[PDB]
Design a protein around this ligand. Sequence first.
Ligand SMILES: OC[C@H]1O[C@@H]2O[C@H]3[C@H](O)[C@@H](O)[C@@H](O[C@H]4[C@H](O)[C@@H](O)[C@@H](O[C@H]5[C@H](O)[C@@H](O)[C@@H](O[C@H]6[C@H](O)[C@@H](O)[C@@H](O[C@H]7[C@H](O)[C@@H](O)[C@@H](O[C@H]8[C@H](O)[C@@H](O)[C@@H](O[C@H]1[C@H](O)[C@H]2O)O[C@@H]8CO)O[C@@H]7CO)O[C@@H]6CO)O[C@@H]5CO)O[C@@H]4CO)O[C@@H]3CO
Ligand SMILES: OC[C@H]1O[C@@H]2O[C@H]3[C@H](O)[C@@H](O)[C@@H](O[C@H]4[C@H](O)[C@@H](O)[C@@H](O[C@H]5[C@H](O)[C@@H](O)[C@@H](O[C@H]6[C@H](O)[C@@H](O)[C@@H](O[C@H]7[C@H](O)[C@@H](O)[C@@H](O[C@H]8[C@H](O)[C@@H](O)[C@@H](O[C@H]1[C@H](O)[C@H]2O)O[C@@H]8CO)O[C@@H]7CO)O[C@@H]6CO)O[C@@H]5CO)O[C@@H]4CO)O[C@@H]3CO
Ligand code: HEM
Ligand code: HEM
Ligand SMILES: CC(=O)N1CCN(c2ccc(OC[C@H]3CO[C@](Cn4ccnc4)(c4ccc(Cl)cc4Cl)O3)cc2)CC1
Ligand SMILES: CC(=O)N1CCN(c2ccc(OC[C@H]3CO[C@](Cn4ccnc4)(c4ccc(Cl)cc4Cl)O3)cc2)CC1
Lengths: 444, 445
Amino acid sequence: VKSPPYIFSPIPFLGHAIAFGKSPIEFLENAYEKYGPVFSFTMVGKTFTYLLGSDAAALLFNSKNEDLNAEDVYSRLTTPVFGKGVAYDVPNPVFLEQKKMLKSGLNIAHFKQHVSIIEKETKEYFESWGESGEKNVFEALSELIILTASHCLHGKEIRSQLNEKVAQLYADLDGGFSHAAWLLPGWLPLPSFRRRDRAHREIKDIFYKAIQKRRQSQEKIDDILQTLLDATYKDGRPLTDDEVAGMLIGLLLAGQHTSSTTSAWMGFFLARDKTLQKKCYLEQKTVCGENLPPLTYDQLKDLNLLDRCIKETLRLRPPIMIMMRMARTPQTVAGYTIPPGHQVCVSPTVNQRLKDSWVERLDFNPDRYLQDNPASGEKFAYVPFGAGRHRCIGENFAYVQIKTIWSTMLRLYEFDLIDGYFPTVNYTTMIHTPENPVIRYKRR
Amino acid sequence: VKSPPYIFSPIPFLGHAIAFGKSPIEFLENAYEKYGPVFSFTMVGKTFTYLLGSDAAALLFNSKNEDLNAEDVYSRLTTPVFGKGVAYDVPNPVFLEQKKMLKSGLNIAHFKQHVSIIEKETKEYFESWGESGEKNVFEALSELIILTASHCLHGKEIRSQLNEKVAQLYADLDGGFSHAAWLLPGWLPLPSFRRRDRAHREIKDIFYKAIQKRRQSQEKIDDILQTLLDATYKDGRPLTDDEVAGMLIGLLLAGQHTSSTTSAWMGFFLARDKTLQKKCYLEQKTVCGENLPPLTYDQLKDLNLLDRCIKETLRLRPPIMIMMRMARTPQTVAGYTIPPGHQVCVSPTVNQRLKDSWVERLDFNPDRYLQDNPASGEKFAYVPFGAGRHRCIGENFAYVQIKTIWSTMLRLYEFDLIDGYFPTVNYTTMIHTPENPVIRYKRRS
Ligand SMILES: OC[C@H]1O[C@@H]2O[C@H]3[C@H](O)[C@@H](O)[C@@H](O[C@H]4[C@H](O)[C@@H](O)[C@@H](O[C@H]5[C@H](O)[C@@H](O)[C@@H](O[C@H]6[C@H](O)[C@@H](O)[C@@H](O[C@H]7[C@H](O)[C@@H](O)[C@@H](O[C@H]8[C@H](O)[C@@H](O)[C@@H](O[C@H]1[C@H](O)[C@H]2O)O[C@@H]8CO)O[C@@H]7CO)O[C@@H]6CO)O[C@@H]5CO)O[C@@H]4CO)O[C@@H]3CO
Ligand SMILES: OC[C@H]1O[C@@H]2O[C@H]3[C@H](O)[C@@H](O)[C@@H](O[C@H]4[C@H](O)[C@@H](O)[C@@H](O[C@H]5[C@H](O)[C@@H](O)[C@@H](O[C@H]6[C@H](O)[C@@H](O)[C@@H](O[C@H]7[C@H](O)[C@@H](O)[C@@H](O[C@H]8[C@H](O)[C@@H](O)[C@@H](O[C@H]1[C@H](O)[C@H]2O)O[C@@H]8CO)O[C@@H]7CO)O[C@@H]6CO)O[C@@H]5CO)O[C@@H]4CO)O[C@@H]3CO
Ligand code: HEM
Ligand code: HEM
Ligand SMILES: CC(=O)N1CCN(c2ccc(OC[C@H]3CO[C@](Cn4ccnc4)(c4ccc(Cl)cc4Cl)O3)cc2)CC1
Ligand SMILES: CC(=O)N1CCN(c2ccc(OC[C@H]3CO[C@](Cn4ccnc4)(c4ccc(Cl)cc4Cl)O3)cc2)CC1
């Protein structure tokens, strides 16, 4: 019985809050060098054990929620946003069943509807950008993906309900994913806290309309919303309008920022490497045809450089930078015993550029997978959508959304850095955004 | 006409204060990577331009004080501590004459007196350490250096006055060297300013009577104090007691924490590398004889290995991390022009560790000066004592003090890391101290 190596700190309560908050990746890498794959440190009165590399990460991924708990650590910020009865407000096994319902709605038949739907929105959004200029790509992508995600994961009913003042209510909901919502108790009246809670009530209320609007129309519509309204537990109990609305919010959030971010980054990687940008466009012609017809799901499967470009963007910029659990029981990894109380953590980001197992780690090189790599060489070195019980379900949909958008975007425009500026990473938010994400764009 | 590359910060007033504050060398080397030898950034509403590498630092080192001025940047810290009419409170030509006088005291005749003074102080101090144990070297060293530096630089009369009270007065003065004193206006009253001011008066008062008393006795004492009492500007004008008192405070502050931090680090470099440590002890025997007799200045010149260990310590841990100037007129380096108003900096630490010119840069290797190295291969790669008009005058004394101390310390003890711990650097203060500088020791064979 032995404790993970502990990283002592000068500052009594803050701990490593300032060094880690400043640049978590450098911090975690420096710690990996000095202390190894399993270590502890204190931030803001809380102790964190991190698991780095595949072997160590294995513990968090392979474990039961009974032993490494996700609600204990997420409820604080998620439950106020998504709502009661949904996600981390219920016991895990109840959650899994809701996960299976959402899974059902994410299949090839729906994805075939999604492709053309997203393609139209993309084309129609970018009518405002004209033939050339300099605009913020991430904000454009943020707005577009709020349109595409809603169109696909919510109904046409809800998509037709989106205006300026609804995006504001979504923005209010984003402000729930904060530094402060995690650390500070909910009973404090902060600006962001009231802002968020106001929007939750409103948007639940807006979803109540559209659920009622569809529950009553007879036209057989087969999208994701229908899948939810039709589903049932092992019980045989259908979902309450509340439950449904709860998981509609969870879909909107999961599906929006994780794809805007990633799309935005890939933009800058492709603008920095103009040869690779050219090859992606060439592959568009080679696969789909020189006449560039509207996109099909079946064509997507064959855009393999684009696919690896997305694989590689997610490698160097996974939007979920950290996974967390609470140790409810003692757990053993690498010979260390993590005591109950620690928040146990894995970082895809660190794992995915770890010097031990990636060649030219900081290089944007989608051909790395066409060689030997730990993404197939190792279990948990490449892990942007997690693994085990808490593993993602949006991977196919996120690949469809991003793929369609960038196909359309490369068809519209050639992209370039402004004065060679490659954006750095903003760590002031759990939304990890590119700093000043403005690209130059020529018509193709 | 082009200004240096500038590093932007989101944070409005503070700018890079946190990123620089936390790890300056890390910050500066990453900046070197992205931007090159010359760049500018801002902290707490001040803009800094750094000159990294021999070629760039040549600007600061070669420049005249009118162009790149030190009073403008040092005075707020310095004058309150040393007092008026001294150092950076007077125009630079006046300071040079002052430096010339101090220099004339730092000669071989006095250094020979110093050796046997310092050795005795060292032997006597470390009697409280006993056969073995675990103690805080850095604390022991600063305590010791206060005694040795006073004895050598102030004289026997002042050293006999050194008690618990006076040690506290000096520590209050040290408190004047805060980042706070550099940033915040002097009419504010933090606890530490009051202390600095009160202690400045009480120390001057002590030095006054000490100066008075020797100006009177007939004992022909040939030391650094007498050199000051007998000195004269080109004028013909001798120093007033307040000037003598000033530079005496200057001397103790100067010759104290520079030697104590450097000695402490060397302790840790020697404890980390045990076969190096033993070779140093063998050198003692090989040079001074097997009997290990009392140290002499002459013997110190032939301790080449210990010399290079100090040289190498100063290379990796120079006590003065940043030298600074105010730009009064515009200056040009590497094609860039620094506007008047920027604070222009060099860091010996960064220069002395630069991938480009240092083979295995982070390695403590005293024998690197027996190969081809940039200390002789370049101009300003190795500059722990500065260069140009503001060049240090204390190097020879520093070496005498540290060699004598560590020579003795090696004869007395063998040193070890506690649990393989090597202290990291404390940056929260201007005395760049080692973290938890406790060392293991046992009586040497
Ligand atoms: O000696 C090296 C160390 O010195 C300085 O640390 C001081 C620090 O600045 C102050 O904060 C204070 O420490 C108090 C601390 O704040 C409290 O948390 C508490 O500490 C207790 C721990 O909570 C508890 O876990 C246990 O500690 C044991 C560890 O659990 C166990 O793993 C092991 O620790 C070893 C580490 O695992 C290993 O990594 C290595 O530690 C290195 C550190 O990681 C590194 O940061 C540095 O530490 C410096 C530090 O920077 C200084 O500021 O080097 C270390 C090399 O040793 O080795 C560890 C063993 O040394 O064992 C420990 C038990 O030894 O108990 C502790 C109480 O002991 O109370 C503290 C009250 O002092 O003071 C410290 C000491 O000067
Ligand atoms: O633009 C004119 C500028 O040109 C020269 O600077 C170049 C520099 O020498 C190159 O090294 C390189 O600099 C890179 C830079 O170091 C990186 O940090 C990065 O910068 C991006 C930021 O990371 C990102 O945050 C954002 O910047 C925004 C700021 O965060 C925000 O505060 C605000 O900027 C305000 C400034 O804070 C404020 O001081 C003021 O700035 C003006 C300067 O004071 C003035 O000297 C001049 O700068 C010259 C510079 O001296 C040349 O050497 O004009 C400045 C701006 O007009 O005014 C701002 C208030 O609006 O807004 C910015 C958004 O711009 O984005 C930046 C830029 O991508 O990227 C750089 C790599 O390209 O390039 C620069 C520029 O060519
Ligand atoms: C690039 C896009 C995406 C990435 C990189 C991503 C990443 C992740 C990661 C890392 C996890 C594991 C979290 C943990 O273990 O703590 C996860 C879980 C999950 N994701 Fe995503 N996601 C993306 C898009 C989506 C989409 C579009 C949806 C909705 C269809 C979604 C819904 C979910 C759900 C329901 C979970 C399960 C949470 C749990 O079981 O505790 N994600 N995702
Ligand atoms: C190892 C110990 C020492 C180191 C590393 C050191 C370092 C330095 C450095 C880097 C400078 C240049 C300052 C600048 O340009 O900003 C300097 C200047 C100076 N030092 Fe030292 N020093 C040491 C010991 C001493 C001692 C013992 C004395 C007095 C006996 C002393 C007195 C001075 C003086 C008078 C200056 C000139 C300041 C000026 O002209 O602006 N130093 N020293
Ligand atoms: C203290 C500290 O150092 N830190 C505070 C906590 N910090 C953190 C916060 C949240 C987090 O996230 C995990 C939870 C919350 O969000 C998702 C991630 N997600 C998003 C899309 N797919 C998955 C999620 C799951 C299902 C659904 Cl329906 C929707 C979503 Cl948003 O899992 C991960 C890390 C890490 C940094
Ligand atoms: C904002 C910022 O980034 N920062 C704050 C200011 N920072 C700084 C502060 C002081 C400094 O110091 C140079 C001046 C001050 O002190 C000496 C150094 N000194 C000591 C011994 N030998 C030389 C000195 C010279 C002669 C005599 Cl008589 C006595 C002394 Cl104390 O020169 C150098 C740098 C640099 C870091």
